[PDB]
Design a protein around this ligand. Structure first.
Ligand SMILES: [K+]
Ligand SMILES: [K+]
Lengths: 166, 173, 166, 174, 173, 174, 166, 166
């Protein structure tokens, strides 16, 4: 009984404290909370990204971000961030399921994909069990904490989903 | 060099290049990740984004005439990468301009912008472009499945990349 | 060898003279040319409607309007207007084919539909031969020239199109 | 290990609510926000609002044990040339405890490991041998001497420009 | 120093100092060469001119309480000069604050602003101020005749000046 | 005297109609207008409008015999510290004729005698011995060497900073 | 020991309640308090009119208005309004003296004038004793409470003032 | 038969070419013509300065600038600039007379003053003959062409003028 609800202004302090590492709101960087607030106001009607607070038993446990929503090509990227204090309880996989529900059954998308660090085998395994296939290995794609990291792109499609989970 | 495609250069895109840009193509086109069809839309977006350094464009010209466009997009200086696309006017295809311009795009990204990685996306069935980029030193990193709906069907694309070390070796001994 | 190209500001005088009867630009009425110009400027980046000049042998012969584009429900309405001087040559059906091509193969829509007067059997027949089924009869839906007219809504879907014309 | 000696000095992104702290870190010496001068608090606030999305400067409050002890400013961030200047200001009430050097290390970590810069540099008064020595021990080499470059308190002062590069850092601190 | 007027300093004017400013005085007063009477007018002008460096203001404070104002106006860095005025709250007159503050104003103009000349204007019949400024090293440069209409009559003013050499001598051995 | 040899090289204030000339003085090296980058002509025009009353930079067309031969840029004008950087650009078609040195003299005249500055300085590539020599003969002393300070054409270049002061000028050229 | 001080926003409620009869702020009419506030904001730096609260023993007793200030011709009109609860105590004449002081000794004007109803002999007498001569009788110049009223214009000049009161 | 007329936008190119030395429009510096144009637009209704083209026989021969107009203290500074090609013909003194006429007889000022270089005895003599007395010697008041110059302030008053020239 984990669910998604739309991000609201009053959720930003929660968002700000989920993490040193660049964060992006509508492809625009922010560090300070004030910067995040300003960007949140500036992009309020932009449908190219959508965000949801993940909540269980009324407490806020993480964030879902769909970004690069494109309805002509019918795809979006998604990212799940779980509050460090609620990690290791399979909320990530529960929320990934909800993100899939939303993208395929409300937004009418054909493809969802995601990016994870090559060395995050735990997440790679979770996404493989949910039905995601690996489509790409982006080499040295992000400079993080002094070193270039490699990421795996993974994807799933709307027919295989509206079968296996519907 | 002397008896050959020799005089190809790049210059910064200017407002008066837009009619040329508009006529290089059926297919959604994007200016700073914003769609346009009409020329008027393209003009408006061009004005709106004039100081944004996240994309940079160059007209390819040879013998004084405009023959194509280079687009570097998603320029990110923290990760030190960019995507690029070379578009050759259909009337100037088959004269080796794509590869000539690709070399100039690489020069610019690695030697002026100080990037570490450049990459590009091409249709899996664009063997001509795939071959050109393999000869220039690009390795294949990714096959993005059914990533674009074009002319009624989902197409698959190849992502290809080259890094600033392999470039400042292979073209800078 | 009839084709579609995107409407440009310089096409508005042509648009204005294709017709006494209310005309709409982004669901906003206009009569005078100046009103049409102003609305054209005001809505330039709005993707909820798209327009194309139909041209053959370099001369302008009509207009295609897709309106109420919705990418979540994946549909749009379309209207073909042929210049009175180029009617009776089957440009309407040629342009309807191009509108179908565009909506289904570029925009990735699932359903296109259109509205025609119940008494326009000639147009109803053309659209039936192109594969459109009748979905509705909207009774007394428009007051035109002193009387309430009834319209037929007709639709076609993207799988039957990407078979029969692809 | 349990038996280390370690400081809990850290850096966090500057916020609007940090400005009163910033303002009172120094009427006597011109201070600049995005290369624009300010004296009054009101002027600082206005400039802070005006420059909020500009990435050419980045600021961090230095804090230890949860209290605010200073400010780090990286300015003239240029990602094509891959460099930045930095300035450390330590609150006068927390001077003499090696926080400057501790914060300089954190500034280096951030510039080289987050921002992906190749060169960091700083400016100090030629007569500040204590600071010059600290920066020499952290790995900074002297690159030059800007003569009579600032009029401060009635006299033209000379400054030393010191620098460290991304290779010498990802060696000496890894 | 110990048993004396000792703790006088200058700090930058802030918005919350304006009520104090407004009540230091019959006489037109100017903020960035623009007149005001009402407090509301002063507030509005204060906002309107916040980043203008052609004037700079400091509250004079002693023992933590606000005792006056320093105004440097017509700051010109090409000619390297400024005019200044010291205003002491009437309730803190007769304690040597004017001369203490004048010294601080001189310090600021010559040692922080890098000015070559500071000058001031006082009524010809303000012998008290004339005397203080003569002792601080100011020479008389000008007698401006009937230069201000004040309280029904045309008053004559003395312009006085000191230069950056005579200052960084007399107060900086 | 009638029998002098003299150039009619002068400086006049940059105008909007000079921008096409400016634009074509150099796709290969980043150029800056009020510390803001531009490549396209349109971008240059926009920045020119946006900064028209800003006195922190001043520009002059160098002209001789009524034709435009180059540009002088004084940048980072600071009147509290009483200094400015300057850059001379000579049109490639008018190089090798000592206009750089002639224009540098005019730039000095203007900075010291109109702007009332105490220090002027400039930056040149360490490997440009020809320019270094010219500036040494005009009275500029070397103040330092900024190491690997610019990424240009695939490599990190080192620059020399050179300076002259208002006393040494109002001696040597009066 | 009655004095003048500059009108401030917080004096407007007092102003509004000193009076059915049109009132003007910078030659613009108002009835409601909100209208007065808006006009007060709109005209804050306009030196063509100046206003002063008349106060005695710290309580607000009336208003002085100088209007049509013209510094080339060196004149202004003034009006004294006394709160009805403080009338009949010669505050009007005390305030008129202060208005004269201000106009002639601070503003450097050459002529001040005022308008009063022809039938207000009490005010006419006060102003005659202060040195004002009658310059004009404006016939049927104001419609007030159903009838056209006639007004007397009265004036005094700066030399006769800087003699007789200085 | 030299006269004054109000400065107009179309006079700016003439103004720009009368002169290396800082010039001011409403106390704001300009060098380029574009800067002068922009400032001219920005200050069009500001009465604190007024400018007049001096013209004789229909050709433009110079400029009069009244600046720091203050109507409470009833004074202004003025500057005469004569085009170098029309110097040495006593247009300066003719224009100074017109500036006096305007300031005292139209603007109703009490005092006009001017600033000239101490070493410009020719101008000092002209102004002494017109009735100006020296009021001040401002020492090292302007840095010009590498050196600090000293200026003489000179003034004349409205009663002595409306006698001697009226
Ligand atoms: K700087
Ligand atoms: K700089």
């Amino acid at each position: 009984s984990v669910r998604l609800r739309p991000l609201e202004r009053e959720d930003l302090p929660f968002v700000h404290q989920l993490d040193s590492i660049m964060r992006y709101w509508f492809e625009e960087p922010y560090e300070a909370f004030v910067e995040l607030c300003d960007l949140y106001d500036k992009h309020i009607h932009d449908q190219s990204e959508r965000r949801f607070i993940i909540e269980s038993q009324g407490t806020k446990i993480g964030l879902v971000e769909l970004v690069e929503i494109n309805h002509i090509h019918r795809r979006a990227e998604f990212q799940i961030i779980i509050d460090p204090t609620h990690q290791g309880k399979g909320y990530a996989g529960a929320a990934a399921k909800l993100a899939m529900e939303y993208g395929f059954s409300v937004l009418n998308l054909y493809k969802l994909y995601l990016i994870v660090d090559k060395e995050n085998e735990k997440a790679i395994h979770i996404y493989s069990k949910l039905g995601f296939e690996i489509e790409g290995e982006l080499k040295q794609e992000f400079f993080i904490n002094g070193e270039y990291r490699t990421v795996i792109r993974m994807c799933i499609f709307q027919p295989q989903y509206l079968a296996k989970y519907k």
